[PDB]
Structure formats: C-alpha cells, structure tokens
Amino acid sequence: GSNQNNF
Numbered sequence: 001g002s003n004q005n006n007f
C-alpha cells in the first residue's frame, strides 16, 4: 500500500 508522512 501507499504511505504519506506530513511533518
């Protein structure tokens, strides 16, 4: 699956 990190 797909991953996003929003710092």
Ligand SMILES: [Zn+2]
Pocket: 001, 002, 003
């Ligand atoms: Zn994946």
